[PDB]
DNA sequence: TGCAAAAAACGCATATTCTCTATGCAAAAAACGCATTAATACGAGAATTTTGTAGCTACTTATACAAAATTCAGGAAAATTTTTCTGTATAATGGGAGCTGTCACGGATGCA
């Protein structure tokens, strides 16, 4: 009869992951960083994002893999 | 304790006489008339004269334009206070607080 137990309850087994994978994330966590961060450096230049996936990298990146980029570079920092 | 009865008083004979009711005297008030003088009012004269009426004149104001010399309402800076946003780096690893003595009713489910 609780959501703070909710929290508990499915949570309170919820670890840290300790700290190693602060680094898989660091990669990550620019990875994002840029992604975006470019993606809206171009929004900033013009077409205030032509909502086109490519430009979600100033690099190039085939659609699919640069969705890898995200997603995994997303539930790093999730 | 009945009166018969005597002397002096107390009652039928007038002087006295003395408050007393009664008219003429007289003296000064008063008020009436002779009346005299003065004053209260009528007669005339022309003098002031204020009020009543006209026109001129000076003051006072009816009115028509408006930006006087001053008031005010926003507009746009500061000025300082205050508000919202962003940031500060060891480890820290499952939450307390009453419900347990109410009676009775009406469904609504579970549990063999």
């Known amino acids: ?4 137990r909710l929290y508990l309850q499915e949570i ?3 670890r840290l992951l ?5 680094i898989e994330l660091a990669r990550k966590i620019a990875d994002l960083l840029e992604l975006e961060r470019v993606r809206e450096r171009l929004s900033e230049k013009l077409e ?9 990298e100033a690099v ?6 640069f ?5 995994i570079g997303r539930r790093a920092k999730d």
């Open 60 to 65: 190039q990146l085939p659609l699919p893999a």
């Open 67 to 71: 969705r890898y980029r995200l997603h």
């Open 12 to 14: 309170g087994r919820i």
């Open 48 to 56: 205030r994002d032509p909502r086109d996936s490519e430009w979600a």
């Open 1 to 4: 009869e609780d959501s703070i």
């Open 18 to 22: 300790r700290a190693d994978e602060e």
